[PDB]
């Protein structure tokens, strides 16, 4: 995943 990304996050941020």
């Given at each position: 995943?990304?996050?941020x």
């Open positions: 995943v990304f996050a």
